[PDB]
Design a protein around this ligand. Sequence first.
Ligand SMILES: C#Cc1c(F)ccc2cccc(-c3ncc4c(N5C[C@H]6CC[C@@H](C5)N6)nc(OCC56CCCN5CCC6)nc4c3F)c12
Ligand SMILES: Nc1nc2c(ncn2[C@@H]2O[C@H](COP(=O)(O)OP(=O)(O)O)[C@@H](O)[C@H]2O)c(=O)[nH]1
Ligand SMILES: [Mg+2]
Length: 169
Amino acid sequence: MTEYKLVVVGADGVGKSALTIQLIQNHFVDEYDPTIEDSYRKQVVIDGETSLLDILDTAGQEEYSAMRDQYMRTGEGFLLVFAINNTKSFEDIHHYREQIKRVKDSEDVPMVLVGNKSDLPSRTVDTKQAQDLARSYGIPFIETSAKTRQGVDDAFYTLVREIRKHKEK
Ligand SMILES: C#Cc1c(F)ccc2cccc(-c3ncc4c(N5C[C@H]6CC[C@@H](C5)N6)nc(OCC56CCCN5CCC6)nc4c3F)c12
Ligand SMILES: Nc1nc2c(ncn2[C@@H]2O[C@H](COP(=O)(O)OP(=O)(O)O)[C@@H](O)[C@H]2O)c(=O)[nH]1
Ligand SMILES: [Mg+2]
C-alpha cells in the first residue's frame, strides 16, 4: 500500500475540479466553486497495488509565497490540464510545467498532459498539437471528459505509473 501526492494544475475553467470529483465520486459536478482549492483521497488498486491517492485540486489567486513553493514541491506527480475548446489554456501549459520544474529542481518530474472537455464539438486545440507538446516534454498525453468520464481513470492511473517509473530511475 503506497500513498501518492498528486496535483491537478492548469488554467481556470479547464475542468480540474470536475475531473477530481469524477474520480472520487463518479459523477459530473456542473457547479464546483471556482475559487476553492482543496484535496481529496481516493483509495484504489492500480495494477494490483493498493494506492492512496491524495489529490490537490488547485485554484484561487495566483501567488508565489515561499510556503506555496514548498508545498508544491511535495507533489509527486502533476496533471497538466487544458481544455480542448480553449487555446489560451493550452498555451498556459508551458507556465505550469516550468513552475513545477522550478520548485522541484528537476527536469524529470512525473507529469501527464490532459486535454479535457473532449466531449465538446467546439475544438480549437488539435490533438496533434497536444501530442507534439507531450512528446517534446517526454510525457504521456490523455484525452478526457469530466462530463462523460472518458479517460479520467486513465489520466490519474497513468500519472501513478509515471511516478513508479520515476522511483526506479
Ligand atoms: C498551479 C501551480 C503551481 C505549480 F504547478 C507548481 C509550483 C507552483 C509554485 C507557486 C505557485 C504556483 C501557482 N499557483 C497558482 C497559479 C495560478 N492561479 C490563478 C488562476 C489560474 C489557476 C488558479 C491558480 N486560478 N495562475 C497561474 O498562472 C496564470 C497565468 C499564466 C501565466 C502566468 N499567469 C498570468 C495570468 C495567467 N500560475 C499559478 C501558479 F504557478 C505553482
Ligand atoms: N462539457 C464539459 N464541460 C466540462 C468538463 N469539465 C468541466 N466542464 C465544465 O467547465 C466548467 C469549469 O469546470 P471546473 O471543474 O470548475 O474547472 P476548474 O476551474 O479547472 O476547476 C464547469 O461549467 C464545468 O461543468 C468536460 O469534460 N466537459
Ligand atoms: Mg476548480
